[PDB]
C-alpha cells in the first residue's frame, strides 16, 4: 500500500532501495535512515557489502574560487557491513523483505540530533561544480574491506535530505523598539517594529507593524524595511553571509517631535532574488528548483555546526540610521505525506 | 628586524602553497613585509653623515616606508570590511577582487 | 601619538632626536611583524596540522 | 504530452452501486493524479488528489488506487448528492492534460468577460480573497460548452513562473498582481476558437495538492 525509491549498479546489480527521500528533524531525535538491498551474488568470494552514510559540507566562495582552493568537509560518516557473509529489523524493511526474498539485506542508521540541515548555497551561472552547501549521501561498495579502492562500477549513490518543520507552538512574537539620543543635548527618539508571529511559512506575507515616535525637530528622510538573512557558516572560521532577500524603500516624510504608525508588509521569494549567489536555499536533489533556507533551529543543548541559516526583519531610518533587528525564523509547515523533491508539474 | 622580516619571507615562499599565506592575500602581505625591510633600511639613512642625497633619501625611505604598510593595511582592511558587512542594498555579491 | 609630540618638543637635542626617530621606525617594524605575522609564522610553521583545506532514481510498489 | 483515457467515458446507475471509473495515463506519472467533480453551471471541487490522499471537505467513499499506471475512482454509495461530471487530472508533468470527463446519471472573482467580437484583445480579471499569490499558485482552466475541461494558463509568483499550453504558446498573457492579490490574463485571438467558460483557480503553491479553489466564471463567447 506504499511506495519506495530504488536504485541499481551495474556489475553487481546491488539494488538499494530506500523508504523516502527526506528525513525529519526532531530537536530529540532524527528519523531513522532504514532501507534494504538486493545483493545478486557477482562474485565468488568478495561477500561484503558496505553501506556508507555522509553528511559532506562544501563550500567556496566567488574569491575562494578566483584564489583557488574551497573546502569541504566529512560532518559525519558511518559505514555498516550491511551484509552478514545487530540492527534489528522495521515494519518497513518487513514489508519489503517480504516483497524482496531471501537475499534482501537490511540496513538501518540514525543520524544523531544537531547535524545541520540539507541546506544548499545557490550556485552562479559560471559555478558548474559540486554545489555548495550540506548534502547527505548514502552508497552502497562491494567490496572486501576497504583496502580495494572504491570501484565505481559497484557502488550506488543516492542523496537523502533531512529537514525541519514548523512547530505548532508559535513562540514569542518578535517585538523590539529602539530609542536614540541625538547629539543635539539629550533628545530622544523612538521606533518601535513588531510582527504577526515567530515563524513563517514560505511565501506568507510579513506585515512588520512599525512606529515612529520622534521626539526632535529633526524629519525622517525614507523608511528602508528589508528582510536579511543571515547564512552563519561554522567552519574554517568563514564569515557571516549576509543577504537582504526582500526590501521596501518606503519613503515618509514625518513632522517633527510627532508620532506616526503604519504597517508595511514584505515577503520573501526567489523570484525577484535568483542572482545573488551564495544564497542558502533548501536542499536540492539533483539541481532542482526549492525554495530559500528553512530557518534551522538549534532547540536542543548545542553545538554550532555546518550551515546556521536564520532571517530577521531590519527596518532603517535615515538620519545617520536607526536600525532595528527583529529576528524570526521561515520554514515550511508539517506536510501532509511529503514534499515532491522536485517542481511539482516536472517540465 | 631585517633579519626576522628577511627569515619570515624565507619562510612565506617556502610554504607558500598553504591556504593560510594565500587566503590572507599574499601580495598584500609580501608588500608589507617589504615595506618593513624598507623601514629597518631607512634607519642606516637616519644614522649617517648628512648630504642633500642623504637628507632626500632619508625622507624618501620614511614616507614611503610608513606609506606602503599602511596602505597595505587600509587594503587589507577594506577587503575584509566588504567580505564582512554582506550584500549592501541592491547589490548581488559585494566580493572584491583580491 | 607617544612618538611623535615627543620627537616635536625635544627638537634641541640631536643624539635623542636621531635615536627616536631611528628606534621607532625598527620599533613600528617590530610591531607590524610580531603583530600580524607571528600568529600567521606560528600557525603555519609550529602547527602544521590546522592551515589545512579538506578533512536513475526509479520506484515501486509496497504492499501492505 | 501524455494523454489520459478514461474508460469508461459515460456511467450512468442508480443509487448505493459502487461506481467505479479508470484513468490510464500514456506515459508513467508516478501517482501524481488529482479528480474533480462539476455541476451544470458550478465550478468544480476537488475530491482525490495525489493517488488515493482525500481531500479536506468530501465524505470517505471516494478513494484513489495507482494500479501501475492505471488509476482508479470509486464510490462506494451513489449518494443522490453524488450526481456529476468527473474528471482526470494529471500533474506530474507539462502540460496537466486532463482525462475524457465521465457524467453520472440517475473567494475568486473572474470578471471581464461577456459576448465577444469576432477578433481582438480581452482581460479576464481574478480577484483572488483569502490567500497571497506569493503562498499560491493561480491557474486559469477552460471549458467549452458541453466539453472537457483543458489547462489553460498558469503563475507560479514565488518561482516566478509563467506557463502555457503549447497550443496557446504567446497567445495569453498571464500576470500577478500583488497590489490588489489579483491574478490578470491577456487574451489576444480571434473568432471562436477558444470560446468558452473559463474559470480562475488556485492551487497551493509548494506542494501543490491539486486545484483546491474555483471561481464562479464567466462565458467568453464570441
Ligand atoms: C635596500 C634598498 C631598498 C635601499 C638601499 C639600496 C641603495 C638605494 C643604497 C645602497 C647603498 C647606498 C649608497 C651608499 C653611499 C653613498 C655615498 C654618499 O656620498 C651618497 C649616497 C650613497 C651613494 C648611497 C645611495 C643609496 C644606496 C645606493
Ligand atoms: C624609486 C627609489 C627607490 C629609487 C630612486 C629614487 C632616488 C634615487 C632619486 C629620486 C629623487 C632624486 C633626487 C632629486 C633631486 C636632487 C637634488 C640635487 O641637488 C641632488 C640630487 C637629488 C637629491 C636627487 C637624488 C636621487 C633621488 C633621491
Given at each position: 500500500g506504499?511506495?519506495?525509491?530504488?536504485?541499481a549498479?551495474?556489475?553487481?546489480?546491488?539494488?538499494?532501495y530506500?523508504?523516502?527521500?527526506?528525513?525529519?528533524?526532531?530537536?530529540?531525535?532524527?528519523?531513522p535512515?532504514?532501507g534494504?538491498?538486493?545483493?545478486?551474488?557477482?562474485?565468488?568470494?568478495?561477500?561484503?557489502?558496505?553501506?556508507?552514510?555522509?553528511?559532506?559540507?562544501?563550500?567556496?566562495?566567488?574569491?575562494?574560487?578566483?584564489?583557488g582552493?574551497?573546502?569541504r568537509?566529512?560532518?559525519?560518516?558511518?559505514?555498516?557491513?550491511?551484509?552478514?557473509?545487530?540492527?534489528?529489523?522495521?515494519?518497513?524493511?518487513?514489508?519489503?523483505?517480504?516483497?524482496?526474498?531471501?537475499?534482501?539485506?537490511?540496513?538501518?542508521?540514525?543520524?544523531?540530533?544537531?547535524?545541520?540541515?540539507?541546506?544548499?548555497?545557490?550556485?552562479?551561472?559560471?559555478?558548474?561544480g559540486?554545489?555548495?552547501?550540506?548534502?547527505?549521501?548514502?552508497?552502497?561498495?562491494?567490496?572486501?574491506?576497504?583496502?580495494?579502492?572504491?570501484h565505481?562500477?559497484?557502488?550506488?549513490?543516492?542523496?537523502?535530505?533531512?529537514?525541519?518543520?514548523?512547530?505548532?507552538r508559535?513562540?514569542?512574537?518578535?517585538?523590539?523598539?529602539?530609542?536614540?539620543?541625538?547629539?543635539?543635548?539629550?533628545?530622544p527618539?523612538?521606533?518601535?517594529?513588531?510582527?504577526?508571529?515567530?515563524?513563517?511559512?514560505?511565501?506568507?506575507?510579513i506585515?512588520?507593524?512599525?512606529?515612529?515616535?520622534n521626539?526632535?525637530?529633526?524629519?525622517?528622510?525614507?523608511?528602508?524595511?528589508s528582510?536579511?538573512?543571515?547564512?552563519?557558516?561554522?567552519?574554517?572560521?568563514?564569515?557571516?553571509?549576509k543577504?537582504?532577500?526582500?526590501?521596501?524603500e518606503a519613503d515618509?516624510?514625518?513632522?517633527?517631535?510627532?508620532?506616526?504608525?503604519?504597517?508595511?508588509?514584505?515577503?520573501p521569494?526567489?523570484?525577484?532574488?535568483r542572482?545573488?549567489?551564495?544564497?542558502?536555499?533548501?536542499?536540492?536533489?539533483?539541481?532542482?528548483d526549492?525554495?530559500?533556507?528553512?530557518?534551522?533551529?538549534?532547540?536542543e543543548?548545542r553545538?554550532?555546526?555546518?550551515?546556521?541559516?536564520?532571517?530577521?526583519?531590519?527596518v532603517?531610518?535615515?538620519?545617520?540610521?536607526?536600525?532595528?533587528?527583529?529576528?524570526?525564523?521561515?520554514?515550511?509547515?508539517?506536510?501532509?505525506?511529503?514534499?515532491?523533491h522536485?517542481?511539482?508539474?516536472?517540465? | 628586524?631585517?633579519?626576522c622580516?628577511?627569515?619570515?619571507?624565507?619562510?612565506?615562499?617556502?610554504?607558500?602553497?598553504?591556504?593560510?599565506?594565500?587566503?590572507?592575500?599574499?601580495?598584500?602581505?609580501?608588500?608589507?613585509?617589504?615595506?618593513?625591510?624598507?623601514?629597518?633600511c631607512?634607519?642606516?639613512?637616519?644614522?649617517?653623515k648628512?648630504?642633500?642625497?642623504?637628507?632626500?633619501?632619508?625622507?624618501?625611505?620614511?614616507?614611503?616606508?610608513?606609506?606602503?604598510?599602511?596602505?597595505?593595511?587600509l587594503?587589507?582592511?577594506?577587503?575584509?570590511?566588504?567580505?564582512?558587512?554582506?550584500?549592501?542594498?541592491?547589490?548581488?555579491?559585494?566580493?572584491?577582487?583580491? | 601619538?607617544?612618538?611623535?609630540?615627543?620627537?616635536?618638543?625635544?627638537?634641541?637635542?640631536?643624539?635623542?632626536?636621531?635615536?627616536?626617530?631611528?628606534?621607532?621606525?625598527?620599533?613600528?617594524?617590530?610591531?607590524?611583524?610580531g603583530?600580524?605575522?607571528?600568529?600567521?609564522?606560528?600557525?603555519?610553521?609550529?602547527?602544521?596540522?590546522?592551515?589545512?583545506?579538506?578533512?536513475?532514481?526509479?520506484?515501486?510498489?509496497?504492499?501492505? | 504530452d501524455?494523454?489520459?483515457?478514461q474508460?469508461?467515458?459515460?456511467?450512468?446507475?442508480?443509487?448505493?452501486?459502487?461506481?467505479?471509473?479508470?484513468?490510464?495515463?500514456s506515459?508513467?506519472?508516478?501517482?501524481?493524479?488529482?479528480?474533480?467533480?462539476?455541476k451544470?453551471?458550478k465550478?468544480?471541487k476537488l475530491?482525490?488528489?495525489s493517488?488515493?490522499?482525500l481531500?479536506?471537505?468530501?465524505?470517505?467513499?471516494?478513494?484513489?488506487?495507482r494500479?501501475?499506471?492505471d488509476?482508479?475512482?470509486?464510490?462506494?454509495?451513489?449518494?443522490?448528492?453524488?450526481?456529476?461530471?468527473?474528471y482526470?487530472?494529471?500533474?506530474?508533468?507539462?502540460?496537466?492534460?486532463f482525462?475524457?470527463?465521465?457524467?453520472?446519471?440517475?473567494?475568486?472573482?473572474?470578471?471581464?468577460?461577456?459576448?465577444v467580437?469576432?477578433?481582438?484583445?480581452?482581460?479576464?480579471?481574478?480577484?483572488?480573497?483569502?490567500?497571497?499569490?506569493?503562498?499560491?499558485?493561480?491557474?486559469?482552466?477552460?471549458?467549452?460548452?458541453?466539453?472537457?475541461?483543458?489547462?489553460?494558463?498558469?503563475?507560479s509568483?514565488?518561482?516566478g513562473?509563467?506557463?502555457?499550453?503549447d497550443?496557446?504558446?504567446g497567445?495569453?498573457?498571464?500576470?500577478?498582481?500583488?497590489?490588489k492579490?489579483?491574478?490578470?490574463?491577456?487574451?489576444?485571438?480571434?473568432?471562436?476558437?477558444?470560446?468558452?467558460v473559463?474559470?480562475?483557480?488556485?492551487?497551493?503553491?509548494?506542494?501543490?495538492?491539486?486545484?483546491?479553489?474555483?471561481?464562479?466564471?464567466?462565458?467568453?463567447?464570441?
Amino acid at each position: 500500500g506504499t511506495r519506495v525509491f530504488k536504485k541499481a549498479s551495474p556489475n553487481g546489480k546491488l539494488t538499494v532501495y530506500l523508504g523516502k527521500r527526506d528525513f525529519v528533524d526532531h530537536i530529540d531525535l532524527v528519523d531513522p535512515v532504514d532501507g534494504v538491498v538486493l545483493v545478486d551474488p557477482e562474485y565468488l568470494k568478495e561477500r561484503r557489502v558496505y553501506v556508507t552514510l555522509t553528511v559532506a559540507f562544501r563550500y567556496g566562495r566567488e574569491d575562494l574560487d578566483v584564489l583557488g582552493l574551497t573546502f569541504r568537509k566529512d560532518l559525519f560518516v558511518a559505514n555498516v557491513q550491511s551484509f552478514p557473509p545487530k540492527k534489528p529489523l522495521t515494519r518497513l524493511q518487513e514489508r519489503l523483505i517480504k516483497k524482496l526474498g531471501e537475499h534482501a539485506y537490511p540496513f538501518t542508521f540514525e543520524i544523531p540530533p544537531n547535524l545541520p540541515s540539507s541546506v544548499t548555497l545557490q550556485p552562479g551561472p559560471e559555478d558548474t561544480g559540486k554545489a555548495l552547501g550540506v548534502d547527505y549521501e548514502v552508497k552502497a561498495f562491494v567490496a572486501e574491506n576497504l583496502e580495494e579502492k572504491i570501484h565505481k562500477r559497484n557502488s550506488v549513490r543516492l542523496v537523502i535530505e533531512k529537514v525541519q518543520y514548523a512547530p505548532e507552538r508559535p513562540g514569542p512574537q518578535p517585538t523590539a523598539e529602539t530609542t536614540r539620543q541625538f547629539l543635539m543635548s539629550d533628545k530622544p527618539l523612538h521606533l518601535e517594529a513588531s510582527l504577526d508571529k515567530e515563524i513563517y511559512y514560505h511565501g506568507e506575507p510579513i506585515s512588520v507593524n512599525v512606529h515612529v515616535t520622534n521626539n526632535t525637530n529633526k524629519t525622517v528622510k525614507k523608511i528602508k524595511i528589508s528582510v536579511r538573512q543571515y547564512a552563519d557558516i561554522v567552519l574554517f572560521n568563514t564569515a557571516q553571509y549576509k543577504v537582504p532577500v526582500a526590501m521596501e524603500e518606503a519613503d515618509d516624510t514625518v513632522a517633527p517631535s510627532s508620532t506616526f504608525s503604519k504597517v508595511y508588509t514584505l515577503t520573501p521569494f526567489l523570484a525577484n532574488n535568483r542572482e545573488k549567489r551564495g544564497l542558502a536555499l533548501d536542499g536540492k536533489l539533483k539541481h532542482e528548483d526549492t525554495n530559500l533556507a528553512s530557518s534551522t533551529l538549534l532547540r536542543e543543548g548545542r553545538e554550532i555546526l555546518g550551515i546556521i541559516v536564520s532571517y530577521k526583519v531590519k527596518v532603517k531610518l535615515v538620519v545617520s540610521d536607526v536600525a532595528v533587528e527583529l529576528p524570526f525564523t521561515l520554514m515550511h509547515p508539517k506536510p501532509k505525506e511529503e514534499p515532491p523533491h522536485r517542481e511539482v508539474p516536472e517540465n | 628586524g631585517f633579519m626576522c622580516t628577511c627569515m619570515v619571507v624565507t619562510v612565506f615562499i617556502k610554504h607558500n602553497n598553504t591556504p593560510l599565506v594565500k587566503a590572507s592575500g599574499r601580495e598584500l602581505c609580501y608588500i608589507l613585509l617589504f615595506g618593513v625591510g624598507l623601514s629597518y633600511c631607512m634607519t642606516f639613512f637616519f644614522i649617517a653623515k648628512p648630504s642633500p642625497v642623504i637628507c632626500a633619501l632619508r625622507r624618501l625611505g620614511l614616507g614611503s616606508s610608513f606609506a606602503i604598510c599602511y596602505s597595505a593595511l587600509l587594503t587589507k582592511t577594506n577587503c575584509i570590511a566588504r567580505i564582512f558587512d554582506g550584500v549592501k542594498n541592491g547589490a548581488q555579491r559585494p566580493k572584491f577582487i583580491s | 601619538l607617544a612618538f611623535l609630540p615627543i620627537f616635536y618638543v625635544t627638537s634641541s637635542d640631536y643624539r635623542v632626536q636621531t635615536t627616536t626617530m631611528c628606534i621607532s621606525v625598527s620599533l613600528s617594524g617590530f610591531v607590524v611583524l610580531g603583530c600580524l605575522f607571528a600568529p600567521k609564522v606560528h600557525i603555519i610553521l609550529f602547527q602544521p596540522q590546522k592551515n589545512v583545506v579538506t578533512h536513475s532514481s526509479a520506484s515501486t510498489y509496497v504492499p501492505t | 504530452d501524455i494523454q489520459m483515457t478514461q474508460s469508461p467515458s459515460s456511467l450512468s446507475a442508480s443509487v448505493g452501486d459502487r461506481v467505479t471509473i479508470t484513468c490510464r495515463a500514456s506515459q508513467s506519472v508516478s501517482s501524481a493524479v488529482a479528480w474533480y467533480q462539476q455541476k451544470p453551471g458550478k465550478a468544480p471541487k476537488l475530491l482525490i488528489y495525489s493517488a488515493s490522499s482525500l481531500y479536506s471537505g468530501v465524505p470517505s467513499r471516494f478513494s484513489g488506487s495507482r494500479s501501475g499506471t492505471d488509476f482508479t475512482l470509486t464510490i462506494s454509495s451513489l449518494q443522490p448528492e453524488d450526481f456529476a461530471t468527473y474528471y482526470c487530472q494529471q500533474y506530474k508533468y507539462v502540460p496537466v492534460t486532463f482525462g475524457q470527463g465521465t457524467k453520472v446519471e440517475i473567494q475568486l472573482v473572474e470578471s471581464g468577460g461577456g459576448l465577444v467580437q469576432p477578433g481582438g484583445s480581452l482581460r479576464l480579471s481574478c480577484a483572488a480573497s483569502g490567500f497571497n499569490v506569493y503562498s499560491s499558485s493561480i491557474h486559469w482552466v477552460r471549458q467549452a460548452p458541453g466539453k472537457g475541461l483543458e489547462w489553460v494558463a498558469s503563475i507560479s509568483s514565488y518561482y516566478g513562473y509563467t506557463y502555457y499550453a503549447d497550443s496557446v504558446k504567446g497567445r495569453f498573457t498571464i500576470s500577478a498582481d500583488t497590489s490588489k492579490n489579483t491574478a490578470y490574463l491577456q487574451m489576444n485571438s480571434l473568432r471562436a476558437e477558444d470560446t468558452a467558460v473559463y474559470y480562475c483557480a488556485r492551487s497551493r503553491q509548494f506542494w501543490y495538492s491539486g486545484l483546491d479553489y474555483w471561481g464562479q466564471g464567466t462565458l467568453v463567447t464570441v
